[PDB]
Amino acid sequence: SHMCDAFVGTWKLVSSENFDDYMKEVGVGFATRKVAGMAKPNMIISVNGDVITIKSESTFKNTEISFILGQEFDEVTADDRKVKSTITLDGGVLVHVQKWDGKSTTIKRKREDDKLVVECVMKGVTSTRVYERA
């Protein structure tokens, strides 16, 4: 057993709050906000050795990142930002920082009861997205 066992699996979005406002704060344009905000992604998390993979599959976009904790990587986000990302585990929470154009946003993933809760923060704006096992 290891670091991220409780995250591994296939998860489906069941609720979202304030995501349009988060996307506005990030700089996502109108059309992308509308289509992205409609999506009901599945999130697939797996681990092989030290490499964690997070896939997001939806009608909007299919994305995949693979990474080692603490080791920076280049990421093209679903809204087409080219960012430098670093993901760490802090007290059982996966903390994903993205940097681009002198800006920064943090995405936290945590297990709470049977859910996987995703908190996205840009400056003062937070969005909460709740996923359940598929």
Minimum distance, C-beta of residue 91 to ligand WKN, in the bound complex (Å): 20
Nearer of residues 3 and 40 to ligand WKN, judged by Cβ: 40
Which structure tokens are listed for 26?
């990030």
72: left (phi over 0), alpha (psi -120 to 50) or beta: beta
Is residue 130 annotated as involved in ligand binding?
A: yes
Is residue 129 annotated as involved in ligand binding?
A: yes
Nearer of residues 71 and 106 to ligand WKN, judged by Cβ: 106
Minimum distance, C-beta of residue 89 to ligand WKN, in the bound complex (Å): 17
Minimum distance, C-beta of residue 1 to ligand WKN, in the bound complex (Å): 25
* Share of the chain residues as helix, strand and coil, in percent rounded to the nearest 5: 15, 55, 30
Name the one residue in this structure whose structure tokens are 């995405």.
Answer: 107
Nearer of residues 39 and 89 to ligand WKN, judged by Cβ: 39
Rg (CA), the chain: 14
Whole-angstrom Cα distance, residue 119 to residue 26?
Answer: 14
Whole-angstrom Cα distance, residue 17 to residue 63?
Answer: 21
Q: Which residues bind ligand WKN (CB under 6 A)?
A: 13, 23, 28, 36, 39, 41, 56, 58, 60-61, 77-79, 107, 118, 120, 129
Nearer of residues 21 and 79 to ligand WKN, judged by Cβ: 79
Whole-angstrom Cα distance, residue 24 to residue 121?
Answer: 12
From the annotation, which residues make up the binding site for a fatty acid?
129-131
From the annotation, which residues make up the binding site?
129-131
